[PDB]
Ligand binder design. Structure first.
Ligand SMILES: CCCCCCCCCCCCCCCCCC(=O)OC[C@H](COP(=O)([O-])OCC(O)COP(=O)([O-])OC[C@@H](COC(=O)CCCCCCCCCCCCCCCCC)OC(=O)CCCCCCCCCCCCCCCCC)OC(=O)CCCCCCCCCCCCCCCCC
Ligand SMILES: CCCCCCCCCCCCCCCCCC(=O)OC[C@H](COP(=O)([O-])OCC(O)COP(=O)([O-])OC[C@@H](COC(=O)CCCCCCCCCCCCCCCCC)OC(=O)CCCCCCCCCCCCCCCCC)OC(=O)CCCCCCCCCCCCCCCCC
Ligand code: HEA
Ligand code: HEA
Ligand SMILES: CCCCC/C=C\C/C=C/C/C=C\C/C=C\CCCC(=O)O[C@H](COC(=O)CCCCCCCCCCCCCCCCC)COP(=O)(O)OCCN
Ligand SMILES: CCCCCC/C=C\CCCCCCCCCC(=O)O[C@H](COC(=O)CCCCCCCCCCCCCCC)COP(=O)(O)OC[C@@H](O)CO
Ligand SMILES: CCCCCC/C=C\CCCCCCCCCC(=O)O[C@H](COC(=O)CCCCCCCCCCCCCCC)COP(=O)(O)OC[C@@H](O)CO
Ligand SMILES: CCCCCCCCCCO[C@@H]1O[C@H](CO)[C@@H](O[C@H]2O[C@H](CO)[C@@H](O)[C@H](O)[C@H]2O)[C@H](O)[C@H]1O
Ligand SMILES: CCCCCCCCCCO[C@@H]1O[C@H](CO)[C@@H](O[C@H]2O[C@H](CO)[C@@H](O)[C@H](O)[C@H]2O)[C@H](O)[C@H]1O
Ligand SMILES: CCCCCCCCCCO[C@@H]1O[C@H](CO)[C@@H](O[C@H]2O[C@H](CO)[C@@H](O)[C@H](O)[C@H]2O)[C@H](O)[C@H]1O
Ligand SMILES: CCCCCCCCCCO[C@@H]1O[C@H](CO)[C@@H](O[C@H]2O[C@H](CO)[C@@H](O)[C@H](O)[C@H]2O)[C@H](O)[C@H]1O
Ligand SMILES: C[C@H](CCC(=O)O)[C@H]1CC[C@H]2[C@@H]3[C@H](O)C[C@@H]4C[C@H](O)CC[C@]4(C)[C@H]3C[C@H](O)[C@]12C
Ligand code: CUA
Ligand code: NA
Ligand SMILES: [Zn+2]
Lengths: 72, 56, 44, 75, 40, 513, 258, 91, 227
């Protein structure tokens, strides 16, 4: 019945989301970025990207995404 | 809100010979003409772009 | 819509010589295209 | 020594990991020996096997990456 | 199958024209390209 | 009226007609490409240029023959025309989505012809293997245009598969079980299931190739930890089912043609024929790596793929023997369509048997990437799929058009095409055994005689294709209107006359339990 | 006619859809190679116009004109099931790519998974929250379904609104995790498999959320009866498909692949 | 808590016609397989039509894969050309 | 190498190639027989005015139609898989040689003892010496010892290639980032030819393989002279 699935929605499902939201909130905060090492299997560039200067990924984050030449 | 489905059933069953994509009235014709103009015009532009890209 | 022989097709068969012309252009353009593509690639 | 013998760890047509493992084993051994100041001659078997199996350009690329600090294997 | 006689009969002469025009529509354009390959 | 009818169709027959016109045009392109191949190889030396222009022609030949000629004619053309009529249905389940399956193909074809016109073309083979198909060895737009062509052809066929499965399951007379539908209808339902499952995997693989080429992914690039051989697995997971997709509707048409021209009410061993097609469809998903016997896989893997591939001969044999058993005791009518079907049974058998030779991984070491493979697949495609298409076309042309062909001309056409295809492909066995590689613009001098004869064969096939255009013209030119058709009691598609009205089965059939 | 099946009015949308496909593909070509977005933006616009008018007409034919007999509805059920199967096989290709790369990591990676220099996300942080969100949305959409069958307009709307809100939450969480991720699509086969597989999944979540929002407005306008609501069933099946793909991604890429 | 329309309130067009006919045990849109009579000339299978002819498919014996198709015309009962079962049109 | 008007395989140079010839003869007899039987049966079905058009019972005959083909496939599979596993057997090679495919030539590396490597390019048609074979000769042949088990390792430094020598029964794909192994044993001295067997771009037709098989003592002196 609808009554039972509403009971599960409010009694189990959304409490689970609230608990995992709390869990994520507590373990949030910027972890320290690692030493840049120019590994050849990472920061692949076989063709410039079709946006920006060709060298920045689509959701480039200056804080944690180094360029082939290192952090900006 | 109120249930106005009966009034839309009357409009879409009116015996006027219109196909279903034009049967809502003048706005359907406009949105049809915009769609078909962008498609046919875009297709001509894609052909021009092939012409251009076919030579160095 | 028209029904019956010669009416259930997007091309006319009313005149066999106009039809020969249309079929010539249709099949001929398909067969010619690769030769003209090779010509295009050779002429670059 | 003629060539690298059959190795039951790598019995199939794909010999990539055989070259790789012997290259790692040689450089791990050489590091262990140079560190305590022991003798790299104990590492000789790994050297002969990787030189036999590994393409010259793979060894050359791996050597360049060890010198650069970009070699991704654990030595 | 049975069928009526032709509503617009195609005489041997008319067939020779249709067959000739059909073959030429395939052969002349390809022939022109292959003849001129050296020029390309 | 013309636009509403031919650009805005929701009618299974008119959409079928659009597919047959599209496929016929595609067949002329594919034929021209085949003649450029054989012109290059017809004497030792270089005719056109190096392997790039040559492999652009070879690659386009395959894509045009497979995606724009065979699939549109068998599935889009015969399937749309015949399936609703054979189950008494008033149209397809999704008659407007049906029209989009058709209209995706001209743009798909345009993207393929654009690939060949820009830069130096896609000289990759129809398999499009990286790294040759990657952004270093094939820099520029050609391979991306090929990928997008395949994406549109893939969507066309996926939506078409959803349409056929739904129509065949949901729109039969309520008394008719699946075991009372004609074999052609079974052949289209099974082909549609193969398309539904296989094309999405191709879509995933060519999408990965697209992102390796344009978004700096490395699915197939060892520098990023990728593997060129992963592409091969994804491609062939599709590519083996694809060849069963190309033949299954041909098997269905052959069952109908052999039954009809034997004067029989029914094919021999109906349930065996259904079993055989479902078995072939299933086995066709578990054999793909017989395309990869030289890539370096483990011996036990090669043993499994050898064995699983050979199993397909059992259900396939049941179909061949069932066709022979349909002929047995027939009142044989030596129609042109019967000649196509009899050539099919024999020539398909020969190409199936050379497939069984290739299934042996040990022997495939020496035959792989040689003309022996080319001989195998042209026996099953250029003498199997094509013979079924020509048989179906001459058998059902009067249904579709309301006019008859000249049977004498159609028999002449059969005789020329039979000589041409055998002269083209039989000698390629010798070239393969003696080691001539695939995708070569030129060959060591020893291979000259068989390449010369093969090229002469291809010109005989060209003469057949030109004559076929004339034969279709002569039928429309003369206008011999159909009067009576025999065996309508076991061939429902004929019972509404020739051509059938735009709307058929407005009042459905009466079938009681 | 004395059968129950739908003879559809001649329609331009198949042709506008086919041409929108040409404009999107030739547009992507023109964006990747000739530094221009114009064709692509025309193709995306005509694709959206086509989808809008086509599905509008399906609502006209069904809710307003009565063409969806039980036989037509049964056909649409099969159509949507077959469509979902095809989408399952599409994702299978990306899962195959992922397992191929991760089970036999090549020397370029360091011969290990995850590769040297890759710092995976913690699967117990936002990825676990995302799991809770999509599972919760599977519960709320079931509540919405039962409310509709029981004739309860207000509870159907509340449950469906909750389902859409969770779909939006998942999408905003994934956008933020994309931005925060220390690895990119260009970080070898790890970045390739991660972003393409989770990216197609994200696109399917946006499509599914859009479908649910279409159902929400149709419900506001009283289109659905307590017995006839195939658009809602189809959106719910699609939404369960999106949930199940997520569970496979979570176990495979986020957890087992960390 | 109500506010959702029923099919009885809101179904229209052919959907509504099918709905209302099924309540009356009637099948004008051919959703059900008709049940055979003994099929003798005295007790022919009665084939409804809105015109003067309709296609019959005869599954002559249970589990035959072969269906026998023919036009049934208004007038005297006709027979399946395979099994001789009688059918009569009722326009 | 192949010779004009050749119908079958190049003569076997290795024991495994001999095995493949006898396996092909067995398989081809079966192909000939089945092809012949089908053509004969077609012709028998089509050559009588006698008729039988009533429903025919299928089950008895379908037993024959399935069992006989299953037996024939087992008769192919048994020797097929014996040969597959024989090629895979452990042999103890005396020598390892690497080949790297390139656009458009082969490089060879003999690095068991010294750093010996060289490039191997097709002899252009205009530079053939009288008696030499168009598209098949190379400048630098792959000299190898006869009557010895050799491990050949195959890779690429660019696109796919495939390293083939038909008379030895050899074909190994050349895949960048992968080292594929095969074994080579020539029963005879001589010159053994092959051709690149994976489409690799503009000069795919023009990057052949020439093995030169000689006594060990000659191979050792050649090796020394190539450093
Ligand atoms: C890479 C590209 C891929 C190419 C794929 C090609 C294959 C496409 C398949 C579809 C075929 C096209 C049909 C749909 C739309 C065509 C539009 C059009 O104008 O058509 C006119 C034209 C017929 O002309 P008609 O005789 O004057 O028209 C009679 C109308 O009733 C009179 O109607 P109306 O009076 O109202 O007005 C008709 C009028 C105009 O009507 C309109 O108002 C239409 C306006 C918009 C049309 C947009 C559609 C364009 C087609 C797209 C497909 C590409 O037509 C004309 O007379 C002028 C039109 C000129 C344009 C011709 C385009 C034809 C196809 C092009 C071939 C390929 C070219 C590639 C070049 C290669 C270079 C490298 O249609 C055709 O071209 C049909 C094919 C030609 C005949 C071949 C017959 C062969 C028989 C083979 C047997 C197989 C069938 C077996 C069963 C048969 C029994 C059932
Ligand atoms: C319409 C047709 C238009 C034109 C078609 C083109 C025809 C080409 C002419 C071929 C003639 C060859 C020739 O110069 O014969 C001299 C040749 C010289 O004799 P030989 O040097 O002692 O050759 C014995 C081989 O060494 C025997 O050992 P091998 O190792 O040298 O033998 C391999 C050879 C052996 O294969 C053949 O000899 C081919 C026989 C085909 C019959 C047609 O190749 C094959 O495996 C061919 C694969 C065929 C696939 C399956 C074909 C199914 C047959 C259909 C059955 C119907 C029968 C009635 O005499 C023949 O054996 C006649 C062939
Ligand atoms: C219609 C297309 C089609 C069909 C139906 C088939 C059918 C089969 N094919 Fe083929 N094939 C291709 C098209 C097709 N093929 C193409 C295009 C390629 C190349 C792809 C590329 O690289 O571009 C190819 C390649 C290909 C390869 C790879 C070879 C290589 O690249 O090295 C192999 C390997 O096993 C294979 C085998 C088979 C087998 C076993 C069948 C079986 O299904 C055949 C079964 C039929 C019979 C056996 C005949 C009838 C049976 C009897 C009369 C019963 C008695 C028989 C026996 C007891 C044996 N084919
Ligand atoms: C359906 C598939 C199909 C068909 C029919 C053919 C037909 C032909 N093919 Fe090809 N071919 C392939 C699929 C096909 N091919 C594939 C997949 C490859 C591998 C590509 C690769 O290596 O990447 C290939 C490769 C290939 C090669 C090897 C190239 C190389 O390795 O370098 C050669 C060499 O001769 C060849 C020649 C021919 C010839 C002369 C024909 C002739 O027989 C063609 C003659 C003409 C016809 C058969 C008519 C066609 C038209 C119709 C039937 C229209 C009908 C009209 C109506 C019904 C109205 N093709
Ligand atoms: C919250 C998730 C929602 C996704 C929306 C994001 C972008 C647009 C559309 C996405 C569609 C999904 C998959 C397409 C492929 C790649 C995108 C993967 C997901 C994504 O968005 O990946 C991003 C890269 O995007 C890039 O390159 C962007 C590249 C944009 C161009 C896309 C190219 C389209 C590919 C063609 C599609 C083919 C479809 C096949 C149809 C099959 C028919 C049979 C990751 O960012 P990053 O900066 O690298 O790393 C994060 C670092 N902080
Ligand atoms: C690089 C970019 C390349 C991308 C190419 C894009 C290709 C084409 C552009 C797409 C334009 C889409 C326009 C909307 C189409 C809606 C189809 C639809 O909804 O079709 C329905 C049937 O399919 C059903 O149900 C169930 C099936 C619904 C399918 C919806 C459309 C899918 C489009 C892409 C699918 C690819 C598959 C992904 C897996 C690989 C309805 O059938 P109709 O015959 O209309 O009506 C029947 C009447 O009785 C209804 O009252
Ligand atoms: C930003 C992203 C851009 C990419 C484009 C995709 C974006 C958004 C698309 C969202 C999908 C919305 C679909 C809306 C369909 C509304 C029409 C509808 O739902 O129609 C219903 C029928 O279902 C039907 O056709 C079922 C029709 C089902 C279609 C579902 C399609 C899923 C689409 C996927 C398309 C592309 C995916 C490819 C990804 C690679 C009508 O019948 P009922 O509901 O019973 O009503 C009748 C009752 O009132 C009678 O009492
Ligand atoms: C209704 C039917 C459909 C309407 C069709 C409309 C077609 C007209 C589009 C205008 O054409 C544009 O021209 C720009 C040039 O002015 C290009 O800019 C691009 O190309 C430039 C070349 O100089 C560079 O500056 C950059 O790449 C970039 O700005 C761009 O590609 C191109 O689209
Ligand atoms: C694979 C498919 C092709 C198969 C072979 C085609 C058969 C040939 C058909 C004839 O084609 C023509 O041949 C002429 C020569 O015979 C060419 O004229 C060329 O040669 C003439 C004689 O030298 C000159 O007068 C002309 O100006 C000159 O264009 C002409 O252009 C070309 O159309
Ligand atoms: C209904 C039809 C009527 C309207 C016709 C359509 C008119 C559209 C013309 C706009 O052209 C655009 O110009 C931008 C700027 O010139 C380009 O950005 C390009 O250049 C930018 C920098 O200038 C870069 O940032 C981008 O990455 C890059 O794609 C963009 O591609 C291109 O589409
Ligand atoms: C491989 C091709 C050879 C075809 C073999 C086909 C054999 C079919 C025999 C089955 O037909 C039977 O014939 C009998 C009268 O003789 C009947 O009494 C019997 O009831 C019937 O079932
Ligand atoms: C007042 C109105 C009545 C709708 C009606 O019966 O016509 C109610 C019924 C259910 C309501 C919706 C649901 O309660 C869920 C949402 C609750 C939020 O607090 C507001 C928006 C929200 C999306 C509501 C908007 C609106 O007030 C709705 C649609
Ligand atoms: Cu190297 Cu082909
Ligand atoms: Na040549
Ligand atoms: Zn009967």
């Amino acid at each position: 019945g609808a009554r039972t699935w509403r009971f599960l929605t409010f009694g189990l499902a959304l409490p689970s989301v609230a608990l995992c939201t709390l869990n994520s909130w507590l373990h949030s905060g910027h972890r320290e970025r690692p030493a840049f090492i120019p590994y050849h299997h990472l920061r692949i560039r076989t063709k410039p990207f079709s946006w920006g200067d060709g060298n920045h990924t689509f959701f480039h984050n200056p804080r944690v995404n180094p360029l082939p030449t290192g952090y900006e | 809100f109120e249930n106005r489905v009966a009034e839309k059933q009357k409009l879409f069953q009116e015996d006027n010979g219109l196909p279903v994509h034009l049967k809502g009235g003048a706005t359907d014709n406009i949105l049809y003409r915009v769609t078909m103009t962008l498609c046919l015009g875009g297709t001509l532009y894609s052909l021009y772009c092939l012409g251009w890209a076919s030579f160095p | 819509y028209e029904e019956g022989p010669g009416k259930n097709i997007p091309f006319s068969v009313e005149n066999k010589w106009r039809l020969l012309a249309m079929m010539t252009l249709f099949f001929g353009s398909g067969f010619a295209a690769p030769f003209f593509i090779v010509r295009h690639q050779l002429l670059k | 020594y003629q060539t690298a013998p059959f190795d039951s760890r790598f019995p199939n047509q794909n010999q990539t990991r055989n070259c790789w493992q012997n290259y790692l084993d040689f450089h791990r051994c050489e590091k262990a020996m140079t560190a305590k100041g022991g003798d790299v001659s104990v590492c000789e078997w790994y050297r002969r096997v990787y030189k036999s199996l590994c393409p010259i350009s793979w060894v050359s690329t791996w050597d360049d990456r060890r010198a650069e600090g970009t070699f991704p294997g654990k030595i | 199958i049975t069928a009526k006689p032709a509503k617009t009969p195609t005489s041997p002469k008319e067939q020779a024209i249709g067959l000739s025009v059909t073959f030429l529509s395939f052969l002349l354009p390809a022939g022109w390209v292959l003849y001129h390959l050296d020029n390309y | 009226m013309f636009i509403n009818r031919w650009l805005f169709s929701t009618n299974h027959k008119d959409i079928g007609t659009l597919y047959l016109l599209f496929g016929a045009w595609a067949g002329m392109v594919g034929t021209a490409l085949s003649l450029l191949i054989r012109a290059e190889l017809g004497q030792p030396g270089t005719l056109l240029g190096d392997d790039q222009i040559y492999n652009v022609v070879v690659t386009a030949h395959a894509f045009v023959m497979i995606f724009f000629m065979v699939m549109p004619i068998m599935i889009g053309g015969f399937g749309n025309w015949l399936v609703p009529l054979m189950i008494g249905a008033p149209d397809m389940a999704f008659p407007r989505m049906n029209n989009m399956s058709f209209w995706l193909l001209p743009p798909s074809f345009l993207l393929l012809l654009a690939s060949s016109m820009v830069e130096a073309g896609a000289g990759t083979g129809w398999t499009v293997y990286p790294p040759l198909a990657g952004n270093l060895a094939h820099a520029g737009a050609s391979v991306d245009l090929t990928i997008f062509s395949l994406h549109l052809a893939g969507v066309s066929s996926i939506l078409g598969a959803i349409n056929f499965i739904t129509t065949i399951i949901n729109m039969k007379p309520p008394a008719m079980s699946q075991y009372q539908t004609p074999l052609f209808v079974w052949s289209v339902m099974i082909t549609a299931v193969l398309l539904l499952l296989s094309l999405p995997v191709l879509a995933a693989g060519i999408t990965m190739l697209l992102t390796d080429r344009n978004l700096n992914t490395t699915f197939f690039d060892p520098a990023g930890g990728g593997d060129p051989i992963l592409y091969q697995h994804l491609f062939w997971f599709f590519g083996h089912p694809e060849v069963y997709i190309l033949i299954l509707p041909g098997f269905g048409m052959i069952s109908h043609i052999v039954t009809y021209y034997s004067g029989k009410k029914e094919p021999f061993g109906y349930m065996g024929m259904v079993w055989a097609m479902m078995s072939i469809g299933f086995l066709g998903f578990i054999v793909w790596a017989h395309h990869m016997f030289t890539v370096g896989m483990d011996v036990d893997t090669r043993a499994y793929f050898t064995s699983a591939t050979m199993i397909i001969a059992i259900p396939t044999g049941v179909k061949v023997f069932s066709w022979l058993a349909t002929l047995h005791g027939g009142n044989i009518k030596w129609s042109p369509a019967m000649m196509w079907a009899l050539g099919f049974i024999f020539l398909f058998t020969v190409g199936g048997l050379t497939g069984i030779v290739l299934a042996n991984s040990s022997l495939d070491i020496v035959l792989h990437d040689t003309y022996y493979v080319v001989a195998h697949f042209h026996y099953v495609l250029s003498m199997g799929a094509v013979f079924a298409i020509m048989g179906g076309f001459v058998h059902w042309f009067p249904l579709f058009s309301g006019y008859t062909l000249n049977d004498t001309w159609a028999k002449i056409h059969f005789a020329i095409m039979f000589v041409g295809v055998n002269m083209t492909f039989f000698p390629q066995h010798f070239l393969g055994l003696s080691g001539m590689p695939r995708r070569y613009s030129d060959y060591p001098d020893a291979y000259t005689m068989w390449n010369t004869i093969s090229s002469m064969g291809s010109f005989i096939s060209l003469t057949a294709v030109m004559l076929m255009v004339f034969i279709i013209w002569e039928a429309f030119a003369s206008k011999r209107e159909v009067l009576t058709v025999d065996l309508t009691t076991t061939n429902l598609e004929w019972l509404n006359g020739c051509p059938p009205p735009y709307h058929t089965f407005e009042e459905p059939t009466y079938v009681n339990l | 006619q004395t059968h129950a099946y739908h003879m559809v009015n001649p329609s331009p949308w198949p042709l506008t859809g086919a041409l929108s496909a040409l404009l999107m593909t030739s547009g992507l070509t023109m964006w990747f190679h000739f530094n221009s977005m114009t064709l692509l933006m025309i193709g995306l616009t005509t694709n959206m116009l086509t989808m809008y008018q086509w599905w509008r007409d399906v609502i006209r034919e069904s809710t307003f004109q009565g063409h969806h007999t039980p036989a037509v509805q049964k056909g649409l059920r099969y159509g949507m099931i077959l469509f979902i199967i095809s989408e399952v096989l599409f994702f299978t290709g990306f899962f195959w790519a992922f397992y191929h790369s991760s089970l036999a990591p090549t020397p370029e990676l360091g011969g290990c998974w995850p590769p040297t220099g890759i710092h995976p996300l913690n699967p117990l942080e936002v990825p676990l929250l995302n799991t809770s969100v999509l599972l919760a949305s599977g519960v709320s959409i079931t509540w919405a379904h039962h409310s509709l069958m029981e004739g309860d307009r207000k509870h159907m709307l509340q449950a469906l609104f909750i389902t859409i809100t969770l779909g939006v939450y998942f999408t905003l969480l994934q956008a933020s995790e994309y931005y925060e991720a220390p690895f990119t699509i260009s970080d070898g086969v790890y970045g390739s498999t991660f972003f393409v597989a989770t990216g197609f999944h994200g696109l399917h979540v946006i499509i599914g959320s859009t479908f649910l929002i279409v159902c929400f407005f149709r419900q506001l306008k009283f289109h659905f009866t307590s017995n006839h609501h195939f658009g809602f069933e189809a959106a719910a099946w699609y939404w369960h498909f999106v949930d199940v793909v997520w569970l496979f991604l979570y176990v495979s890429i986020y957890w087992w692949g960390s | 808590g109500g506010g959702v329309p029923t099919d009885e309130e809101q179904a229209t067009g052919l959907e509504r016609e099918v709905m209302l006919a099924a309540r009356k045990g009637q099948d004008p849109y051919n959703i059900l397989a008709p049940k055979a009579t003994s099929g003798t000339k005295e007790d022919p299978n009665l084939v409804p039509s809105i015109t003067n002819k309709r296609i019959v498919g005869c599954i002559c014996e249970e589990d035959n894969s072969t269906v026998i198709w023919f036009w049934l015309h208004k007038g005297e009962a006709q027979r399946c050309p395979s099994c001789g079962t009688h059918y009569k049109l009722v326009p | 190498m192949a010779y004009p008007m050749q119908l079958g395989f190049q003569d076997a140079t290795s024991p495994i190639m001999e095995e493949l010839l006898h396996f092909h003869d067995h398989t081809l007899m079966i192909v000939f027989l089945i092809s012949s039987l089908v053509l004969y049966i077609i012709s028998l079905m089509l050559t009588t005015k006698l008729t039988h058009t009533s429903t025919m019972d299928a089950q008895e005959v379908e037993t024959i139609w399935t069992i006989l083909p299953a037996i024939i496939l087992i008769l192919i599979a048994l020797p097929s898989l014996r040969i597959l596993y024989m090629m895979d057997e452990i042999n103890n090679p005396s020598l390892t040689v690497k080949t790297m495919g390139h656009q458009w030539y082969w490089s060879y590396e003999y690095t068991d003892y010294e750093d010996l490597s060289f490039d191997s390019y097709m002899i252009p048609t205009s530079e053939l010496k009288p008696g030499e074979l168009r598209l098949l000769e190379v400048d630098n042949r792959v000299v190898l010892p006869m009557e010895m088990t050799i491990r050949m390792l195959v890779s690429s430094e660019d696109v796919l290639h495939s390293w083939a020598v038909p008379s030895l029964g050899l074909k190994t794909d050349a895949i960048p980032g992968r080292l594929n192994q095969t074994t080579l044993m020539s029963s005879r001295p001589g010159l053994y030819y092959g051709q690149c067997s994976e489409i690799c771009g503009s000069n795919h037709s023009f990057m052949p393989i020439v093995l030169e098989l000689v006594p060990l003592k000659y191979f050792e002196k050649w090796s020394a002279s190539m450093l």
